[PDB]
Amino acid sequence: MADCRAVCSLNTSDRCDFVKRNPDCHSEGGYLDYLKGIFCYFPPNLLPLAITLYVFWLLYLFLILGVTAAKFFCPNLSAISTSLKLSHNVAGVTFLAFGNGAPDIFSALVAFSDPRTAGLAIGALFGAGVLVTTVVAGGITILRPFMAASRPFLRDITFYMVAVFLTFTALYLGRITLVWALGYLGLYVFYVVTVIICTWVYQRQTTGQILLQALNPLDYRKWRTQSISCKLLKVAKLPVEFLLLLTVPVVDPDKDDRNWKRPLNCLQLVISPLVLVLTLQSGVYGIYEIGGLLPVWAVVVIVGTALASVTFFATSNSEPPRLHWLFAFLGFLTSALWINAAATEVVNILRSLGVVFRLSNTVLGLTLLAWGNSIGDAFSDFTLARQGYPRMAFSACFGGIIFNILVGVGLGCLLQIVRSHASEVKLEPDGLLVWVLASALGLSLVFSLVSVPLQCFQLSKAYGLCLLLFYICFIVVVLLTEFGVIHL
Amino acid sequence: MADCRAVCSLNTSDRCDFVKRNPDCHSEGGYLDYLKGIFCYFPPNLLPLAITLYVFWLLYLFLILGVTAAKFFCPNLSAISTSLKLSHNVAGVTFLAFGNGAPDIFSALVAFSDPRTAGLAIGALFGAGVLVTTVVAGGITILRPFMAASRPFLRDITFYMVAVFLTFTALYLGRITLVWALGYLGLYVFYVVTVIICTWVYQRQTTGQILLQALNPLDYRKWRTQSISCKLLKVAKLPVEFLLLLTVPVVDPDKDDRNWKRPLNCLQLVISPLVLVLTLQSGVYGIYEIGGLLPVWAVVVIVGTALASVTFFATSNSEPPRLHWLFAFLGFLTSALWINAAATEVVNILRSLGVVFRLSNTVLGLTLLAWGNSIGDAFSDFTLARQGYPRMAFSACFGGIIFNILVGVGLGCLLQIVRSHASEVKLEPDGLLVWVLASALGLSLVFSLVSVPLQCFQLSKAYGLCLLLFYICFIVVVLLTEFGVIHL
Amino acid sequence: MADCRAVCSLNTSDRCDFVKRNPDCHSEGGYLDYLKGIFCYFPPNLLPLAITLYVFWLLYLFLILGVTAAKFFCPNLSAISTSLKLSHNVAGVTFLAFGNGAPDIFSALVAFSDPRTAGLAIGALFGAGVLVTTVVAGGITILRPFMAASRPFLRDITFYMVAVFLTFTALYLGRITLVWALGYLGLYVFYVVTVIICTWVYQRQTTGQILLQALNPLDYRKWRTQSISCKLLKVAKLPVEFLLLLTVPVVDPDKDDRNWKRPLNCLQLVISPLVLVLTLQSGVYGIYEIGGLLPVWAVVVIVGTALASVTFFATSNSEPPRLHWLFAFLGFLTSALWINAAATEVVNILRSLGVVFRLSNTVLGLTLLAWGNSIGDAFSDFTLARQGYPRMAFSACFGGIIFNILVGVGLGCLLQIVRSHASEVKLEPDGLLVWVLASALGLSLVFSLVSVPLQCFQLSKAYGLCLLLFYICFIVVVLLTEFGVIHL
Ligand SMILES: [Ca+2]
Ligand SMILES: [Ca+2]
Ligand SMILES: [Ca+2]
């Protein structure tokens, strides 16, 4: 049973049958098979067309991931937390990190779930770390010079350096054991507690019309006000936000009504469980037939419609019911499962590209996956800096990467340990490129640790332009290593 | 026959005879044979002295090329164009590009005329591109910070990126066909038309004394005013400007007399045709004897002196004749042929150095030829920036490289196609250094394309210093590649 | 007799006996044997603990070297010079260079004294040159922007470039002859004379209480005023300064009493000769027994105590004796011998680390030895810049490296020539790393030579941040070369 890569060394007439036959070209989950798409669906003459279509689909999936994380995942998480009365400053610091890091976390979970894709996770986490500490942080200082806060900066840079070196040693050892994963998660909890304690010590020292409106994602006044490019982006997002509005309930403590849309919410009381059962483990559980007579989805629909009718007749259009926060729980779950589905598709596409072109998991992780997972960071942080909040954006840069690495490695490896019933996760490093990537991350961190205090925490355009030049040269070295020009 | 370079591996006593015998050490054109100079005329103990003398001669030739292009080629071209009503703004943008790019164009023509030297042309064009976009543009921003105009910058950077990638693909294919060369020239014409249209849409939205003076290149008042270094440079140029004044007529629409020097111009009516044929094809046609009795140069002299006498007796000292623009045509032709002769000498010297030291055409093209061809850019653009016109200088930087690459490749390859009666010009790339050079040019362009809009087009010293550091590291990598430290 | 690097490839039980037996693992001088410490005294499980202890001891030795040079060597040299009325401006320029460069000079002398350690000297001198011209000079411009003086800068950069290229050619030739060493020292004398002449041409154009106090190194008022880190450093230095106060006499022309401490000085009239005889050449001559009856140290003590009693009874507590400058001579000698002992220990430690880990002399010289020898430069120059004297600090940066290279190579090689009775010092370069280091130094110098005049000598944070990025990338390339990633 040959490897999947062998496909390109066969004759064109046996490619499609090889892909159909070889179990090493089959994916664990997902809905589309991109390799059968390339080698059976598409004429070989039109292979570059298939690949460009794949790239466009990948970019659109990154758009989906960003929108879902920004507008449906974090608001519901914030509703749940505000039900427990936190603080505005910790909220601002940390919820921005959760929102920016949901795609990285779910991509790492999906990649770690399979030994053939596990190198993608390391490539993407370290690659996003390099990109966010050079290009995004430097861009913030180029757009708006400011004076950084010294003590939070030193705290964040120290915690990040520790996490990075821990992962270096786990890579050298070649494995992640259960104790290591629990240690990663514990270190993240310790970091959040330290932030809390330090901040405290410093502080002391008609229904039809509302249905139509609720499902409309366009603000016509704002749309007319915007420029052409903003208009084009809005339309690029319209179908996605329509589906998200249809399926994901949202609870807003900021609004006086808490986004209580009676009929849309009662409809979602049917729709959301169905989407959950149809997207869980790729809907495998959906077609499971109970007792050989009734499938799971039918009984889900029955219970959902009964509960929807009961809620609709036991609630009022003006006043939300006393149990309106359970809707936040449900919307959090549905949004998480949507993000998981999109991440699964992205990982499958990247694996297919690696098979077709014989590219390593590390190089695909550190370029395409990292850039796609950092689009959201770039948008949110550059917007924050342009609005006059560059300290918050700069802090979010270093606070989100800590969450990415610690929670991504710890949770992804823990879930793989538990489901496989094994005792460890194998980290087989693929050549010299992983050590090149590690070296780049370390030296970027060293540059900032020396440079920022030397400027007395007054940051401007020179620091950012130096970081930009560094990232350019890093991509230089990566491409030279991937094509064999630099070999030990 | 034996390879020209095998000369060193011989005994000293057979070197001179080997060079005299081997047809692979002979040049197509020129007046001096530098290899016979090294191996026949000088003793083997004084080889480094010969090489230093060669380097000094090469620098002096670059001085000649710069002066001829600046003060005799462009003024006559401008006279011809102003005879047709050119605008002031397009004139300023584009005539500076022609003046800065004449040496690059003629060097590329000469190098493409021979398969042994064709790698020099690619090395010099890409190398000058890297040098002008880093060192010259950065130096402009270091000398005088300014706000760049966004739309012209984006237009220029886009056109340059397209031209560079087109040449990358022609290099990968390994040839330039006739259709490709015509496409290069057509794309340049399209670029000039686009500049015109965009600018328009934006705008709407005694005789003995005069002979003595005309042949004197010194301004005594200015000379006494200048410092020591400027004085030394003027003297370094005096013999060259004397010969240029003697042989090249100049027409100036700025002056009210249009530089009408009656007796000097009537003398030049004899001298200039003689220089043209004697430097045409390195003078081969000059000694062609018509009918076996009268050589070409004698009949040229006869016709020239008859025409000079007729013009002298049919014209007045105070009022130029009504045909004074034909003198601009003649001066344009004579200046072009002088530039061609100097470029031929430079290319022959570089080939001899490559034979003696076993250096590749790419490394000689990207260091010595590129620097020599960019001395004029540095002088003109830094002077413009120091006088308070940094926007014009910065625009000239990116507008001159487009002319260099498109017209140099297109015209040089087209002339070689037509002259050889072949169908294609073979581009045999010499190792890994050409791809190193391509990578440097591309990333430099990427750095500017990201950096300039991110600064909101406000350019200062930090951007320029980063570009300078980049160029230093590029020369690092080039020297490491040439000596084999990085390799496949 | 196997090369002592093969110690590791043996079984653990024969390591200690191998080290005890092999003469290639024995040092020329010093007091401790670090290899027997690693392989005989400690258990094989605690090797990393031994190495961390060695590193801490090495850092403490660098602290000792810095304190001795700053507070005991230079003050006595200044007393001797001020006895001859030297210029204050020249004093400020040049005495800072002697103080900053004493550790480099003595480390080079010790390393050149043995063929097994001679590569350390070249690595440390060039490495300190790279570090001081990038990190220290850039840090000065980041901490306090200023306008540099053009003529001193151009003079210094020219002299340094000449010295560096001279050493490149000596490395290519593979030796230092006696004429070369004398030429190095003569060129340094020429440089100092040139500085003098240029500056001139520009200018024209109870006893118990006093012993208790004299031996106390703490200033309680200042100590209480300082912060926590300064306090910790003070204690880190207390035992060292106690021993230095005990053994090294100091003469201060600034004080009106010239630091005349009658009883401490009379005690030092005994102590200092004893320390000299106990630390010269590791104490060999100390135990030499004259005539087989009386050792040298006993007769030294007898003469010292007689002379101390005579001086004590022939001098007054209030008025220093007429011969108070001989104490400056004695204190200069004692301080020099203390510095020599500390440098010997540092070199022996570095050789042991190279044996244990199979590291080259070049990489150990350019990282650990260079950083340790430049701690003093960083402290004094950054302190000078923060106090409002960045021109003096920036000048000291380029003036101290000239002293380091010229006097270190010239004097170290001359002393080795004379003592060995040979005619030359062999410079066997160790691989490609030495040429990597040479390339880094040259281009750094080129970057400054172009950049500083282009800014019109107005230096700010952008220039310094570029230099910092360069040094980071240099350490990149060094580590890649040491591990074989780049190679021939
Ligand atoms: Ca992200
Ligand atoms: Ca040019
Ligand atoms: Ca030093």
Tab-separated table of N, CA, C and O and ligand atoms in Angstrom, chain C residues 100-101 103-104 373-374 377 404, ligand 3:
chain	number	residue	atom	x	y	z
C	100	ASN	N	38.668	50.850	29.299
C	100	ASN	CA	37.772	49.899	28.659
C	100	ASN	C	38.521	48.731	28.033
C	100	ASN	O	37.948	47.650	27.887
C	101	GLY	N	39.785	48.914	27.670
C	101	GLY	CA	40.497	47.897	26.933
C	101	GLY	C	41.498	47.053	27.688
C	101	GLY	O	42.067	46.138	27.101
C	103	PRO	N	40.980	44.629	29.973
C	103	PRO	CA	40.635	43.198	29.901
C	103	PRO	C	40.890	42.563	28.541
C	103	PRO	O	41.398	41.440	28.490
C	104	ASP	N	40.577	43.255	27.443
C	104	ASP	CA	40.848	42.712	26.113
C	104	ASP	C	42.339	42.479	25.903
C	104	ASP	O	42.749	41.434	25.391
C	373	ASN	N	34.307	40.785	27.921
C	373	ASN	CA	35.248	41.888	27.793
C	373	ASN	C	34.567	43.201	27.420
C	373	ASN	O	35.200	44.251	27.497
C	374	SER	N	33.308	43.171	26.993
C	374	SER	CA	32.600	44.393	26.621
C	374	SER	C	31.570	44.854	27.650
C	374	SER	O	30.928	45.890	27.439
C	377	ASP	N	32.643	48.331	28.717
C	377	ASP	CA	32.294	49.332	27.713
C	377	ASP	C	30.826	49.702	27.806
C	377	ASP	O	30.475	50.882	27.782
C	404	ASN	N	42.402	48.212	21.205
C	404	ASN	CA	42.277	46.780	21.437
C	404	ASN	C	43.011	45.993	20.366
C	404	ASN	O	43.911	45.214	20.667
D	3	CA	CA	36.467	46.190	26.723
